[model samples]
Target chain A: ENLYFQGMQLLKELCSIHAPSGNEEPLKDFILEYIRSNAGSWSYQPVIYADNDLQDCIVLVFGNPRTAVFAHMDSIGFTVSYNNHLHPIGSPSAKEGYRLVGKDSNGDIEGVLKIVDEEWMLETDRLIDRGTEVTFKPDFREEGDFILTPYLDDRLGVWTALELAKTLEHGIIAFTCWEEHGGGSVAYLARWIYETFHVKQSLICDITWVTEGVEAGKGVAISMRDRMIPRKKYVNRIIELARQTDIPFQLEVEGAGASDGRELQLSPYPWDWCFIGAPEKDAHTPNECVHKKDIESMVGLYKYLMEKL
Target chain B: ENLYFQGMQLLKELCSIHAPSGNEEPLKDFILEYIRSNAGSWSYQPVIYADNDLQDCIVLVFGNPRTAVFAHMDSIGFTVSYNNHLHPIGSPSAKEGYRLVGKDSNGDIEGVLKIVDEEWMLETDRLIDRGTEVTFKPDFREEGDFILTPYLDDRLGVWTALELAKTLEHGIIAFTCWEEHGGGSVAYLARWIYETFHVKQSLICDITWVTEGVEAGKGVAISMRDRMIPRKKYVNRIIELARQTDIPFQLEVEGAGASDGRELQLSPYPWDWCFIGAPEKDAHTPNECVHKKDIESMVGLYKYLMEKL
Candidate 1:
């Protein structure tokens, strides 16, 4: 019950902060602080690869990192492009009134997302260029069996990996950057783990969205192929883990979708990789929804696998 | 005596408004009012056809339009695009502490233009997407022998046409729209004049800038080739008029340049088109300047040509 409710609590805490892609300092700071606070309880001195002041990714090590779990820290948001409207870092698929707020050293600029000429843009007050970062206006709410927020494409992924790290005995949790605009950071991140620890197999800890086959209330989906095909051997192993652990789960094979898994498992320095997460809906909007029970199941199932791996 | 001071006065008045391309209502309203108040004294009904609720061009007719003088009413400015940055509606070649002000149904938003990453974007306060229009923070200054203001690209031409019309006695004075963005309106604007009165030869009075051979203090430029080459016969006529009237002027020709004259002469229903204008320096910024004597000469020379045309 502590792991379950506290996992939900951790998810909420992560959702409350701003961490637009390419500008993940606030998000990373909170994540690093949250992990260090719990490190004493975990009773371990883990090696961390957060050397860069521009913390693209922070690798937390619990033993050998013979097993590693990766999740992106960055979330979908825009870089202030022109006229204080948003140039979406993620390919946001929605209509107007996204309820966004921008932050920089100057101050806070609040407004909503507008689809002007079919491009996602922000309508805001007093915009600063190249420095100000934007995120969806925080709308954390609980509705019956589900929790909804305006945006949680991958901050939820960030928390999921962090929570897993809190409990798991070994491996690396990479909180990476530059995801939504360009998936340029993940390979370097994944390779850093490979060079440092020689971990060949890794689990990409991230969320998937609901489509015709996937539903929100269903348990975690083990992503079979996203952006491109994941190795079948790795896919089969995760499927077996779900059954052995008696964790309710689904299998997803999408024709048009992407994740940092592509950035990780398909580079020249490829690793044996599979994905695990709750199905999300209304992504890159002011109202993205996820099932509470589904998020809890991911924690249980991934925890069971990490223990055995 | 009064028309002389007020001609200069009209120039300053026209320089002080925000009419970026299609959003020219304020400029048109002032022009219509300025003309009507002086109409009774000028002794003419001057069939306007300014009745269109959606103003494309305003025709001020004194008599038979064997010759017509055309200038765009819209000045170059920006429309709001991605991330609260001003996207130039026309190719804004340069920038500064532009003191830009935006107007819409909501209110007037103000900012300065800045060039970041080789693209000019507005660094402004509170921008609304598609709901707002922007102009250079209006600057009308009399700096010794030169007058300076931002965004006088075509407003200067409109005032010049009006000043010449106050004395020219016969010819259609046209104030057109959409020159800075597409110049699409000029063809239809010229066509409307053609269909209405069958005016053959027309003068596109707009602003020119200092470049290579086109010096700033030089009187005016009779555009020999703009966007495309104009009808040499019409070009020859204007050049002769400049010679005969001793209008201190230069001949402008280039491989690639554009004006309302191209929009007029290149359409399927072409008109004999030539351009004449003050050789402006800093053509589309807050400190866009023309020698006071140059503007005064355009008024006198254009008036001389129209009287004889």
Candidate 2:
């Protein structure tokens, strides 16, 4: 029940705040405030650029580097391209309004269509006929009862980070931006941590899978590889930790793309880096959704990992 | 004179298209139309996806597989996050305004402030004493202005590609998207090309330092190693071609980051890959500037190398 409430609250908060890749100031501020209020005991610092763009936020809870968790507060959304262009509507029969394009894991084109009523709809069709006039509906459920807004991808990861920050007893919690841009912020933040603090082993908790499996419960997903980083010793440790703690887990390798771990491993300061994530369905589309119990399992696994670290 | 005029025109065209990373529809359409009109002999196909959100346009020009050149058509800009948030003005004396944080490479908070006519001034010493106020700015600039507005990191590279596409005679050219995110779209595109077209040798063109003695500019910035694949003989051939052409090039290995070459190298199909770039300064920042002459040099060298390939 706590997990459900917290997950819903997190989803609402994430959907409410708008943060896209480089423009993560609002989300960063929200996260910093939350950290200050919730994780007051931890040592925190902001990696501020000349402009207000933050590289990432670093919080040192345990001076030791044996354990670390990474989460990004940024999400995917639209930028006003042209105000006057006649934007297209979503599918004719579908309830969701217009469809528009923004950034996604694949690259960018028209993904979500915003209708006349200001509703956002995901493009279910493979090919969006260019220069078509259409309207969009914001309701995600075809039945018209379920309405979906933006903020699904990493914001879910953001909520998981918040939960981990509140629950974890040891190690550092790194809140990053621009993960959608392929782990650039994490690379920058990890470099700062290595330079500022003398430490080594780290664990990253982001998203792995949703909680709908027959074994539907909280567990760790040991990554063999992602789109960017390959499986390393850290993957082994996650497996070991899961076994030692008697926590449920799924071992798998990411095929589509990589994560911040790629940058971390590739940085000048080398260290053992591992990642944990929740199973998400419809990853980069408007239908993007995650299992609720998966979040709870992530929290539990994180707590156990924190203790081990 | 031809190079300068072409460079300036290409630069303007690049800026005019609102081609942010992942969403290069307009830009790709513009390039494709231009290519169709100009490079009539070059065979082309659109690597379509189920949704544009996950895929950007990746155009392949028929040529010797031994060399591949890549240029991204995306630029860094803002995506409208929240409709209105009272942003903190750096100056305590100024009033708060609703400011939008930019999305991609050129996300300059100060630039947005300046556009909005809000106080761009920040009171560092007084910031601790009182909170800062934020504000919004109007989107007065045209789509083309996005390239020139503040950040033109790889857009400059894109300009070089167009110039080369106009001038070059040989070797495959890949005008890719989302290199700023480091190998997301390009990696997938490379794999797709190898699987579908059976392309073997390739050269990826981008903007780097042609300046005499910079970090990567030492020797055309060959990929000795990076976050992904290591440099092979195919990469060396392009370096040799540059040298044989007496292109005033330097050869050095990239440390952590890799380009489309790395992606192409790792594809299931066997092929040789290399990269050539123009000189760039302050990459991934708002004031990302490239030397005009270097662009010419890059185009000239690419043209020369094409003749050999």
Candidate 3:
């Protein structure tokens, strides 16, 4: 009955914080502070995106790298816009006890979405301004069989990557915002990383759903393609790596969705990319869940690849 | 022997012109001229998008409308950027006999993409100024059972819509641009259409590939979901309509890519949307092919839906 208590602990701590699309400051600060404590063992820089909140994208460079890992700090969220009516940044559920938090002049204003006169409103104690990014405030928990949280799409990948940074001899890890809105962040950030570090082999460490022949709890999921088609050479190498190494894994090709790798194709740097992560259920919703084994094995999968590659 | 001659003719005329992303003037004017001469008993308005080139989005309104059809006027091509190094706007074929054409101050400037020192350079007859949109020159003709052309994507959809307008009694037909780059055009256009017209149901008449259990020439595709999941009720309704009407159709759930409906989800209007089109092979390339049967069936499927709706 051994659990990844340490890994889940980090995930829980980070998941407890609310980091919506364009409002990734608190999460960015937390990671930066953690990196600072880790010291020169790590090299990281801020990728400041111009315009709008949630503008900070942090690139952690532990050079002597091949496979660069990426996870979005931003999750799908709702922002209060126009007549105090909140609209979804991308569609996250307006579920029961679905709460969102923001920093007002008064510290940490939290509220649950309310429906009044058939219009959804964030009925809060604090008087809030328009255009505030709000996110689900779900505590990370082991629910029966799986680790569940509000922001599991990438918070899992990012947390495990932090562990990978501590354990692995070398690799590059990126924590990005602006993924939920599908903007220019990943492309811009990946190109910067490629140019600065000359790293080409990138493993887009992000979550995937259990579909297109990919299932949870089997092991870590490796994508043949994300929203965009992945290159044949790199994706195959990872497939070979998984097979030869006896790493319990599932191979899938996403038919509908895409990841940061889509934008990376535009970079001058040569990219061989695939999405790797634990299988997530109810992806982008309030109660996003992942298999305990899958989450547990995810970091190990990346570790295996980094060593082989 | 059998072909949609009129639609193929328009595709031929437009395909002969270079209408790259951010540069759709000649093609847009070509469509506009055709529309004007037909002298339809209809209400149509030009939607000029600011801060973008070749940005006329035309909305032909036939009131008391329930369903709308959308197609992008722009095709996959390259725009000349600085340093004489060319970049593809959308991934058009970098194949043998791959050529692009645009006009200079004097006469027509013809060019071919040449890979020099592993960097792609636009080697042309005349050193034309940069930022000019260039397109492939393919004389559209019947190639066996298929009508071959440089571009077929939305121009085919556009030509079919023009026919649909005349055939149908009522509906709003939209010609949108900048779809190739995946930008503000579709999202902006759909919301305006929804808000202005009060029509929430939309048929994103775009292209898709024959993959993941979907096939070319099987029939028109009624997407269960596009880039973003569609509203369940409407998409399924179309599926049901196709079955009941006995029109040839394919039920597909896209996993790899998206269409304008991807942007439409953000719209305030409760959208019941699906991407309807023929199965395309080599989408976004010069030799982007589709079965002749799929193309012929595509318009038939829409026409059937319009009458039923």
lDDT of 2 by residue, A1-309 (tens): 222234466566665564554346566667665655555543333222222112334454554445666776655433221232222111122234435443322344454443544633344434332222222212233112222334445666677767765545456667665455434456545655666665455666565434344123444466676665644666676677778865566765656455666667775566677777666555555565555455666677777777775
Model 3 DockQ, alpha carbons vs. true complex? 0.02
lDDT tens per residue, model 1, B27-115: 88777777777766564457675866335568887787777888888887777777656677787655556666776556767777777
Candidate fnat values, all: 0.00, 0.00, 0.00
Estimate candidate 2's RMSD in Å.
24.2
* Candidate 3 lDDT, A1-309, residue by residue in tens: 112224678788778667766456677778777766564453333232222211366766554666677888877777664344566766677764577776544667688888878777687876565445577776677877798788887888788778777666567778876566654456545655676677888888888897658787888898887658878887888888888776688887766787777657654457777888888888877778898888777878898887777
Query: With candidate 3 superimposed using the best TM-score fit, by how many Å does residue B145's alpha carbon deviate from the native?
Result: 1.8
**Of 1 and 2, the candidate ranking higher by lDDT:** 1
- By TM-score, the candidates rank as 3, 1, 2
Candidate 3 or 1, higher TM-score: 3
Q: What DockQ do the predictions score, one after another?
A: 0.01, 0.02, 0.02
Please give the lDDT score at residue A26 for candidate 1.
Answer: 69
- Candidate 1, residues A54-84, lDDT tens digits: the string is 2345878888667778787777765554455
Per-residue C-alpha lDDT of model 2 across residues B1-309, encoded as one tens digit per residue: 222334466565565465565566766777666665555543333232323533656454544343456777765433332332223211111222323232223333432323243523332211111122221222222232122223345566666666666545444567777665444676656655555565555666665432333332232333322333222233445666676765555443332455665555434333455566654554544334454445556667777776776
Candidate 3: CAPRI quality band: incorrect
**Whole-model lDDT for model 3 versus the true structure?**
0.69
